[PDB]
Design an enzyme around this catalytic site. Structure first.
Site, short mmCIF file in Angstrom:
data_model
loop_
_atom_site.label_atom_id
_atom_site.label_comp_id
_atom_site.label_asym_id
_atom_site.label_seq_id
_atom_site.Cartn_x
_atom_site.Cartn_y
_atom_site.Cartn_z
N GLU A 726 -6.62 -22.35 -31.48
CA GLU A 726 -7.18 -21.47 -30.42
C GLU A 726 -8.20 -20.50 -31.03
O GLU A 726 -9.32 -20.42 -30.51
CB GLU A 726 -6.02 -20.81 -29.69
CG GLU A 726 -5.10 -21.75 -28.93
CD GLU A 726 -3.97 -22.26 -29.82
OE1 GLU A 726 -3.07 -22.96 -29.31
OE2 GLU A 726 -3.97 -21.92 -31.02
N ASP A 727 -7.87 -19.76 -32.08
CA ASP A 727 -8.83 -18.82 -32.65
C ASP A 727 -9.09 -19.02 -34.14
O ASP A 727 -9.84 -18.24 -34.73
CB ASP A 727 -8.37 -17.38 -32.40
CG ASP A 727 -8.52 -16.96 -30.95
OD1 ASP A 727 -9.43 -17.47 -30.27
OD2 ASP A 727 -7.72 -16.11 -30.49
N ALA A 728 -8.50 -20.04 -34.75
CA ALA A 728 -8.72 -20.29 -36.18
C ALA A 728 -10.15 -20.72 -36.45
O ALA A 728 -10.75 -21.48 -35.68
CB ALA A 728 -7.74 -21.36 -36.67
#
Ligand code: ZN
Ligand code: ZN
Lengths: 1095, 67, 49
Positions: A726-728
């Site tokens: 998701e935000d990596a």
RNA sequence: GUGUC
DNA sequence: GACGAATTTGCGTGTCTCGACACG
């Protein structure tokens, strides 16, 4: 087509050069130490004793000096801010007064009498840091880009937050749980805060004030004021058919009770009134100067007050029966409060205390004297003033019971994390409401605020609107007087209210004049009044900061001249056209015709929130209509300081804008020009800061191009193997080795050491050598022969920095070796040794630690997109497209649609086009550059026109079917590294009160298991683990009790029965036994009944 | 603070042209003219000199100097 | 139901705070209240005589 | 009290 | 006609008003 002047963008820099962002924080203080400080001296001017009327002192003139320090013995030398910041001293200057006192029979006039000190701002008028040059700013070791505006007390930077409050001297009419109620709050300069309220119930008006026992009828208050005949009462209230049906009942219940004379009403009130001198005089003086003190009474005339109460009753009647109600969300009524008047109140209270208690210092000496003359300068003190000032600034407890007020959390330490966090804190505003869940209106964005407070700038979390920031273009008005205003209004032809009766105010043509909540009189044809007042204001006779508005629903004109109003300049237009032309701004570009003469030539003017209510403002010059009165200079000034760093804010969504303006102050970078000299507690620095390609005009206004907090990096928007979830985000190992994102942490370790009232002392022995060879011991390895660590060394875990040996109470000394605690291996930068103001040695050490980005570090995209790093990929992977350029940071295309961020792609495109061409592209809000002229410029070089390129995958060696989005983006590294957010504990220290793990990582504590996580174990049904990690691993205790009488024994022995026959034991948590021992002292004995587990 | 010796993405030495870039910006040359005359052709190794701040110059005025 | 004999709790239930600031001790509020109520117990016995 | 979820 | 008994209603007061971590 309409004539458009594309030049008005240079008015804003010239306007900020005069005042604006932070210059008003210094304006409020420079005006206070030049105007109000002598007003307070004139207030408390003569004070004498009562022993015999012969002794008295007089206050002639008072003034302050320049920042000075008092050393060992008559040593007053000019001190610099950096010296006070390093020596843990306080930046203050003395206040020398010229008073006169009469001793014996003759009068003594002692000039230059010191009475105390007072802190001075960093960029004030009395300070040394003003009117200097950068070459001289580097001489005093101070950053020239430092905006200033804080206070230095005990070597810390303290700034006072602006606090908003409600308007005083006004009438509010709001609805509550049953119906509608009017209220009035009164507070002038003199300390008298009153809150009266008129309420409606059973068709009967009642007046409530905390000085009266219970309700008093309004007709009774009228008859007591002086208006006796009931006809003129209704005449003053209102002559209308519907207002009489609601005023008849009160009149008839007034006729019910036998009150027809002034003495009857006064006796009635005095009987009603309770207070902890007759009743008639009590009620008379209570109606005189207790209820409404903002309406002065000349001799004993209550006429202005009764007409005021009558118009209040009329406003309540017109509110009654309708849905017209007043709200507190309007910002035209809300006022702001700076640090000036707070310091004014503090200083006047300290001065009154010092005058009143010293009046008692010489009151016990006159009868009990020894000679004929009494000297007062030897009966004088200079510690209470300094103590009070420093305590109020550093502590933060504004407690004035003389003013009946207690406020906490007003001053805060200045954020020195980055250059934006320091300036952005100066524009932070605090609200009067406390942080609660009930509020929804004040937290909601109000339509009233337009160009005064940044909408996007707000912290996301608990406080979601209680903390607000100021806009780029706005000004805070200071207080004035009303003499010439009232004089000109009287000459214009306004009528005296004392001549005409109550019947004429009900006339629709009649308009009432209000000035700071005061009825001046009646005026007809208010349009001419407003026009003439506006023309006189544009002329130059009256000051420009005087608001005037008109309201037709109640037919009243308001004239506002109180300090604390929001003001922003607007361009005036005349019937189709802006007065400002090209020839007027060509001279401004030349170097003459600046802002002040622009205001003097009647071309621009200030408007407030309530004055722009009755005005039409045009956004652009193509939307100018025939009723537009003013023209807004620029539309991009609506955004704040933290929101001016977001490329294309209109392209982005408001949640992303809020996230980015919140994260902009946490981003680490360079602090200023002198970061090697200043020694702060915690400092985060970068190695090689880059310059943003797509910059904003707001960046140039603040000169952020000199201190950037980020770096430009090549980004490839495409999915990778598995680590852009998701935000990596994915990093490049080769780039990290080359040095992309190198950070440095600086920690402070300071130690002071002093003497005592006896001849005991402290000493630093130093290193320890052994008997085998001449080497320093492992404990004291870094220590120098002096006893301290030398800079340029490497300190490991649990090693001594400085030896501190102090006596227990010839004497025995206990050694307290300061030990460095850290998982990392720190380095020593420098060591400072000095003395403080109280003759103690201070040793400061700066510890440096270089860190590199790894898996678990948080990065941002300057577009409200935060993420921790995923997989570190080498250079054999990360495919090049054609030329051999590898992706520096892999971005995931799956977080774009939901977040709905289009400004990111536009910024990438503009940055790519700029780095290819070789010029920075403007990306300001509501303008900047389009995507039509930039894409056609990307063709001349030879690349694709919008975003696409042909890529060749590296892990396989095959081309990619679809094209990938490549381009340079300005990224920034944030705080909260995984190196510090990592803790583990098995068996450490415990508390003395209860045997349980302590709180915090600085003391090596554990984690807490609350009730919500216990509910998850209960819902499953596991009992062994629930008992194992609450009783076995937290606190397992073995206690003993008795079977005869349940009580806590000891050593298998009872003190109640005095026999060990009936004695048994059990396993109990220490918390439960502690609770039992605590409840047994509350006359609550838990008599226990044991049993066998077999039973 | 100081111009990086090598590039971050590819690894081309970009630290030997900073003073030359400075001296070429005063000969009435455009930023693009200096950038394509020095030898930089691609844009990954071009923003190292274009977008770069010099803070060590301002940090030497506060540096200890001998008397 | 009427208290006339007060029960002094154990001393381990009210730990004392020590400061590395002033060679200083800090008692529990219960201990201070006990020392304040015991001073009220001796001020009444003196006033009757 | 501040900062993050 | 006059006094003891039981009903309905305006008004007085006390308790909280999610979790976790880090720093000074
Ligand atoms: Zn027993
Ligand atoms: Zn390169």
């Amino acid at each position: 087509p309409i004539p458009t002047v594309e030049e008005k963008w240079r008015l804003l820099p010239a306007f900020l050069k005069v005042k604006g962002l932070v210059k008003q924080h210094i304006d409020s203080f420079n005006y206070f130490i030049n105007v109000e400080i002598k007003k307070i001296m004139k207030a408390n001017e003569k004070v004498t004793s009562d022993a015999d009327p012969m002794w008295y002192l007089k206050y002639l003139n008072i003034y302050v000096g320049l920042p000075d320090v008092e050393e060992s013995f008559n040593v007053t030398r000019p001190v610099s801010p950096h010296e006070c910041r390093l020596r843990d001293m306080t930046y203050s200057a003395p206040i020398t007064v010229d008073i006169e006192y009469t001793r014996g029979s003759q009068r003594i006039i002692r000039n230059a009498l010191p009475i105390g000190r007072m802190p001075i701002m960093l960029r004030s008028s009395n300070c040394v840091l003003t009117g200097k040059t950068p070459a001289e700013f580097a001489k005093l070791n101070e950053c020239p880009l430092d905006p200033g505006g804080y206070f230095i007390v005990k070597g810390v930077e303290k700034v006072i937050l602006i606090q908003e409050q409600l308007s005083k001297n006004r009438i509010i009419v709001e609805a509550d749980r049953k119906g509608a109620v009017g209220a009035s709050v009164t507070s002038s300069t003199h300390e008298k805060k009153s809150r009266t309220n008129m309420a409606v119930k059973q068709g009967r008006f009642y007046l409530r004030h905390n000085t009266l026992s219970e309700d008093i009828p309004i007709v009774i208050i009228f008859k007591a004021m002086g208006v006796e005949s009931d006809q003129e009462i209704v005449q003053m209230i209102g002559t209308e058919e519907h207002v009489m049906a609601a005023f008849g009942p009160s009149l008839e219940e007034c006729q019910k009770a036998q009150i027809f004379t002034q003495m009857q009403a006064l006796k009635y009130i005095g009987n009603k009134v309770r207070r902890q001198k007759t009743k008639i005089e009590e009620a008379r003086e209570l109606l005189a100067s207790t209820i409404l003190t903002h309406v002065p009474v000349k001799e004993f005339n209550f006429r202005a007050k009764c007409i005021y109460t009558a118009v209040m009753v009329r406003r309540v009647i017109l509110a009654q029966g309708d849905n017209k109600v007043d709200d507190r969300d309007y910002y035209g009524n809300k006022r702001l409060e700076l640090a000036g008047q707070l310091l004014s109140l503090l200083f006047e209270d300290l001065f009154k205390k010092f005058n009143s208690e010293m009046k008692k210092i010489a009151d016990q000496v006159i009868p009990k004297q020894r000679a004929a003359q009494f000297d007062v300068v030897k009966h004088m003190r200079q510690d209470q003033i300094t103590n009070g000032m420093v305590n109020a600034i550093s502590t933060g407890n504004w407690s004035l019971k003389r003013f009946k007020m207690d406020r906490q959390g007003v001053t805060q330490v200045l954020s020195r994390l980055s250059y934006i966090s320091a300036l952005g804190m100066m524009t932070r505003i605090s609200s009067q409401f406390e942080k609660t869940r009930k509020v929804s209106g004040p937290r909601s964005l109000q339509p009233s605020q337009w160009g005064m407070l940044c909408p996007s700038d707000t912290p996301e979390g608990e406080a979601c609107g209680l903390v607000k920031n100021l806009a780029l273009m706005t000004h805070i008005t200071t207080d004035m007087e009303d003499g010439p205003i009232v004089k000109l209004a009287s000459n214009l032809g306004v009528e005296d209210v004392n001549l005409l009766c109550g019947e004429e105010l009900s006339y629709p043509n009649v308009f009432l004049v209000f000035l700071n909540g005061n009825i001046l009189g009646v005026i007809r044809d208010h349009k001419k009044l407003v026009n003439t007042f506006r023309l006189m204001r544009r002329a130059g006779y009256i000051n420009e900061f005087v608001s005037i508005s008109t309201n037709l629903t109640d037919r009243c004109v308001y004239i506002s001249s109180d300090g604390g109003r929001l003001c922003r300049p607007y361009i005036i237009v005349k019937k189709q056209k802006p007065a400002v032309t090209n020839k007027h701004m060509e001279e401004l570009a030349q170097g003459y015709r600046n802002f002040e003469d622009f205001l003097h030539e009647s071309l621009v003017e200030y408007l407030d929130v309530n004055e722009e209510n009755d005005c039409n403002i045009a956004l652009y010059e193509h939307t100018i209509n025939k009723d537009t009165t003013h023209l807004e200079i620029e539309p991009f000034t609506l955004l704040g300081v933290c929101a001016g760093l977001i490329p294309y804010p209109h392209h982005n969504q408001s949640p992303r804008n809020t996230y980015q303006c919140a994260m902009g102050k946490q981003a680490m970078g360079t602090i200023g020009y002198n970061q090697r000299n200043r020694i702060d507690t915690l400092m985060y620095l970068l190695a090689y800061p880059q310059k943003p390609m797509v910059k904003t005009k707001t960046i140039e206004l603040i000169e952020f191009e000199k201190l950037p907090a980020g770096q430009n990096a090549t980004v490839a928007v495409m999915s990778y193997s598995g680590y852009d979830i998701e935000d990596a985000l994915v990093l490049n190992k080769a780039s990290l080795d080359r040095g992309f994102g190198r950070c440095l942490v600086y920690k402070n370790a300071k130690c002071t050491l002093k003497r005592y009232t006896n001849q005991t002392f402290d000493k630093v022995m130093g290193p320890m050598l052994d008997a085998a060879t001449r080497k320093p011991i492992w404990r004291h390895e870094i220590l120098d022969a002096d006893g301290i660590c030398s800079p340029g060394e490497k300190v490991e875990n649990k090693q001594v920095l400085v030896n501190k040996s102090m006596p227990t109470v010839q004497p025995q000394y206990k050694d307290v070796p300061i030990t460095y605690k850290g998982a990392t291996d720190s380095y020593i930068e420098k060591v400072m040794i000095s003395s403080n103001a109280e003759d103690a040695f201070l040793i400061k050490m700066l510890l440096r630690q270089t860190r590199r980005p790894e898996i678990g570090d948080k990065f941002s995209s300057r577009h409200g997109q935060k993420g921790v790093c995923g997989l570190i990929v080498p250079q054999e992977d990360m495919p090049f497209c054609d030329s051999g350029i590898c992706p520096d940071i892999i971005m995931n295309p799956h977080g774009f649609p939901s977040r709905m961020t289009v400004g990111k792609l536009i910024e990438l495109l503009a940055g790519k086009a700029g780095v290819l061409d070789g010029r920075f592209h403007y990306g300001t809000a509501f303008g900047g550059s389009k995507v039509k002229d930039v894409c056609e410029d990307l063709v001349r070089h030879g690349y694709n026109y919008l975003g696409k390129d042909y890529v060749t995958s590296g892990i396989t060696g095959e081309p990619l079917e679809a094209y990938i989005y490549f381009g340079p983006v300005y990224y920034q590294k944030l705080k909260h590294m995984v190196l510090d957010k990592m803790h583990a504990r098995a068996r450490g220290p415990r508390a003395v009160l209860t045997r349980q793990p302590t709180e915090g990582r600085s003391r090596d504590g554990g984690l807490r298991l609350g009730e919500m996580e216990r509910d998850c174990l209960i819902g499953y049904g596991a009992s062994m683990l629930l008992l194992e990690r609450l009783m076995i691993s937290s606190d397992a205790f073995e206690v003993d009790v008795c079977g005869q009488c349940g009580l806590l024994g000891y050593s298998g022995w009872c003190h109640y029965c005095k026999s060990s026959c009936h004695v048994s034991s059990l396993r109990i948590p220490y918390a439960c036994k502690l609770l039992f021992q605590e409840l047994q002292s509350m006359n609550i004995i838990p008599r226990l009944k044991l049993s066998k587990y077999n039973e | 603070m100081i111009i990086p010796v090598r590039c971050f993405t590819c690894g081309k030495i970009v630290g030997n042209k900073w003073e030359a870039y400075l001296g070429l910006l005063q000969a009435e040359y455009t930023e693009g003219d200096a950038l394509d005359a020095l030898g930089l052709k691609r844009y990954c190794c071009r923003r190292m000199l274009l977008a770069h701040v010099d803070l060590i110059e301002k940090l030497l005025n506060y540096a200890p100097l001998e008397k | 139901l009427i208290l006339t004999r007060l029960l002094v709790p154990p001393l381990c239930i009210r730990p004392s705070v020590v400061s590395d600031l002033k060679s200083g001790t800090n008692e529990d509020d219960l201990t201070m209240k006990l020392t304040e109520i015991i001073f009220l117990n001796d001020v009444i016995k003196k006033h009757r005589i």
